[PDB]
């Protein structure tokens, strides 16, 4: 099943304050009005990076797995919300994602429908990046209209190559980032407000 992305997932491209200004940037983004996959728990390709978003009320989503094999031969990334905390670790793990509560060739560890959660996951060998936002919504099965800006949470030191990912367990959606040019309306408070996808249509290109 598929769903439309609208104009959402505009993560702050850099840690820079700008105000009353229309900045132009060439990062990996959701192309506007593209199709995304709709779900309500497969292992999936990661491509150039992932957008993930979900209908928050029950908190059933627990975390994610990322890597190449995700199943021995080499190190792979586990991230899980252990109730009050989040555990991040990068061992040569080998498990199914379905027995989420049950989870050394290892080199790093760290600890951190009423709503929409929005999250973006990105890599470039130069450390692994997570962005997010949360907003209230009506009881609707698919992404609402409007702009949402996603704030950088962490930039984790892991050095792991990623080609594949999985989820630990509401509706949830998967889209992919693409190399795209955006014009970003930073307001008087330096929040990103509106944005233009320069490759969407000829008016946006104008």
């Amino acid at each position: 099943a598929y769903t439309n992305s609208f104009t959402r997932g505009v993560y702050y491209p850099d840690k820079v304050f700008r105000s009353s200004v229309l900045h132009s940037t060439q990062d990996l983004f959701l192309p506007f009005f593209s199709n995304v996959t709709w779900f309500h728990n497969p292992v999936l390709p990661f491509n150039d990076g992932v957008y993930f978003a979900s209908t928050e009320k029950s908190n059933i989503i627990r975390g994610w797995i990322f890597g190449t094999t995700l199943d021995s031969k080499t190190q792979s990334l586990l991230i899980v919300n252990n109730a009050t905390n989040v555990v991040i670790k990068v061992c040569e793990f080998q498990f199914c994602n379905d027995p989420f509560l049950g989870v050394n060739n290892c080199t790093f560890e760290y600890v951190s429908f009423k709503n929409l959660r929005e999250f973006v996951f990105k890599n470039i060998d130069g450390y692994f990046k997570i962005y997010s936002k949360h907003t209230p919504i009506n009881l609707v099965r698919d992404l609402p209209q409007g702009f949402s800006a996603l704030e950088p949470l962490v930039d984790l030191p892991i050095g792991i190559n990623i080609t594949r990912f999985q989820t630990l367990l509401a509706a949830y959606y998967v889209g992919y980032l693409q190399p795209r040019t955006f014009l970003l309306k930073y307001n008087e408070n330096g929040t990103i407000t509106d944005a233009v996808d320069c490759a969407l249509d000829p008016l946006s290109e104008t």
């Binding site: 840690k15 820079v16 700008r18 790093f108 450390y127 704030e151 050095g159 408070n189 330096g190 929040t191």
Partner: protein
């Protein structure tokens, strides 16, 4: 005179130089000193590593300070190879390691680049071009025991030499003849280890020294280790050189009224020039202004009129440099005058200067002409009664010198 390449100057205003307010000090700012590397576990344990099967720590995801190891009085010797111990506090690495063992005072010398003999070839091998430092200290109070502390051992025999950085813990029976040993001592068959037999009465060459060797790797995955970061006091409304989190610049630092978001670190103007920074040691956002600069212009009558001059600092306030703050910049050596005249030498923003009365350069607001009221009424006319014929000279450029240049004769010739 040097600007014009001349011993004579005509009346005018000449831009002779640019001047810039220089930085009064250098400022450095970084976050609070945190996640310092866990080296102490390798030195301060009650047990220690035994050289036939030595132990390695991994150091990662932390800030080091190697200068503790070459300033603490706790150690009997420090040695280093390939890179200076000070340069280790500049460098960065993907991982760092610390190797450890106990050796007798006569044999610690085996822990050096390209060495040979029992310790170097069968216990711990360093290549001819090794980079790293070695810390050694006498431990006769910790590691010696009556009759000998037999936990401390070295490998005396091996099948072949170690390769550079090869770690080995092997204890296989050495064979010295045609008889197969079957994993036990016997005829030409021997246990491969020996002890220094560390006892409290031993002479210094037979006393235990604890030893640690530093080692490092920098890889394609970015550095998880670096040395320590400096910081300074913060100074405001003064021109300073600055370094916030590695961002070099020079300017005046001030308070700000900007509203940065919690993840943002610095603020930018329309042309992508930084105009504010977060101080990493507070919640203060600081505005940055570039240090005051401008052209310096010399205002002169002709040199065959006078050697007196005035100086204009274009766009510079007199705070930053007998003195007069014009809108065009600070003016120095010109007298302000409350009269007005035709503009003799132009300064800008309605100001001009002249040489006048006991004589000096003066500066004044220029006069546009004499004020006149035309005698207008709805029934009055003025009619001329005479006509003064006037001859006026108009002069126009019509042509130019017919210069020609052969580019091959100019470039090559």
């Amino acid at each position: 005179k040097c600007t014009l390449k001349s011993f004579t100057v005509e009346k005018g205003i000449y831009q002779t130089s640019n001047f810039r307010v220089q930085p009064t000090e250098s400022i450095v700012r970084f976050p609070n000193i945190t996640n310092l590397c866990p080296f102490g576990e390798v030195f301060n344990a009650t047990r220690f590593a035994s050289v036939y099967a030595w132990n390695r720590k991994r150091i990662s995801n932390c800030v080091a300070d190697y200068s503790v190891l070459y300033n603490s009085a706790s150690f009997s010797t420090f040695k280093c190879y390939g890179v200076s111990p000070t340069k280790l506090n500049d460098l960065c690495f993907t991982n760092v390691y610390a190797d450890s063992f106990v050796i007798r005072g006569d044999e610690v010398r085996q822990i050096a680049p390209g060495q040979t003999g029992k310790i170097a070839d069968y216990n711990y091998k360093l290549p001819d071009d090794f980079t790293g430092c070695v810390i050694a200290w006498n431990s006769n109070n910790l590691d010696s025991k009556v009759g000998g502390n037999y936990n401390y051992l070295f490998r005396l025999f091996r099948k072949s030499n170690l390769k550079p950085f090869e770690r080995d813990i092997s204890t296989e029976i050495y064979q010295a003849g045609s008889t197969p040993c079957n994993g036990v001592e016997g005829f030409n068959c021997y246990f491969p280890l020996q002890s220094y037999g560390f006892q409290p009465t031993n002479g210094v060459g037979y006393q235990p020294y604890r030893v640690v060797v530093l080692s490092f790797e920098l890889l394609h995955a970015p550095a998880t280790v670096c040395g320590p970061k400096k910081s300074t006091n913060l100074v405001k409304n003064k021109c300073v050189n600055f370094n916030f989190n590695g961002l070099t610049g020079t300017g005046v630092l001030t308070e700000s009224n900007k509203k940065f978001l919690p993840f943002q670190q610095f603020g930018r103007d329309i042309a992508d020039t930084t105009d504010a920074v977060r101080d990493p040691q507070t919640l203060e956002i600081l505005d940055i202004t570039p240090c005051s600069f401008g052209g310096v212009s010399v205002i002169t009558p002709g040199t065959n009129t006078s050697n007196q001059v005035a100086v204009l600092y274009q766009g510079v306030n007199c705070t930053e440099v007998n003195v007069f703050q014009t809108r065009a910049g600070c003016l120095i050596g010109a007298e302000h005058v409350n009269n007005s005249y035709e503009c003799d030498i132009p300064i800008g923003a309605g100001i001009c200067a002249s040489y006048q009365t006991s004589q000096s350069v003066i500066a004044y607001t220029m006069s546009l002409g004499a004020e006149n009221s035309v005698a207008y009424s709805n029934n009055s006319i003025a009619i001329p009664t005479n006509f003064t014929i006037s001859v006026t000279t108009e002069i126009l450029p019509v042509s130019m010198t017919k210069t020609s240049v052969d580019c091959t004769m100019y470039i090559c010739g």
